[PDB]
Amino acid sequence: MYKIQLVNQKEGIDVTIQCAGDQYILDAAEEQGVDLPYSCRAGACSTCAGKLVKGSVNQSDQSFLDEDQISKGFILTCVAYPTSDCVIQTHQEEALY
Numbered sequence: 001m002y003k004i005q006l007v008n009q010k011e012g013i014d015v016t017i018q019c020a021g022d023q024y025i026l027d028a029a030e031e032q033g034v035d036l037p038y039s040c041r042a043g044a045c046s047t048c049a050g051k052l053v054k055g056s057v058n059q060s061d062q063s064f065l066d067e068d069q070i071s072k073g074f075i076l077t078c079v080a081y082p083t084s085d086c087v088i089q090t091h092q093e094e095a096l097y
C-alpha cells in the first residue's frame with residue numbers, strides 16, 4: 001500500500017493516509033475521513049489541485065495543467081494514482097498564480 005502524507009497547515013493539515021495503486025488520491029482521502037477540495041472530479045479544472053513534493057503519481061487523465069505547471073509538481077488529486085509513497089501539499093490551486 002502506498003503511504004500519502006497530505007500537508008498544508010493553513011487549512012490545518014498534516015495527516016497520512018494509505019492509497020492503493022488503483023485508487024485516486026482524492027477517493028482514498030475521502031474513504032479515510034479527510035475532506036479535500038473538489039468540484040468536477042474529472043481532471044478538467046483546478047479545484048482539487050495539489051503539489052507532489054515527494055514521490056510519483058500517474059495523473060494522465062488530467063486535462064487542465066500545462067507543461068510548466070506539471071514541471072512544478074502540480075497535480076489534480078481527483079485523477080492521480082500514486083506509484084510510490086508520496087508527500088502532497090493540498091489546496092494548491094491558490095499557489096498557481
Ligand code: FES
Nearest residue numbers: 039040041045078
Ligand atoms: S475536481 Fe476538477 S480536476 Fe479535480
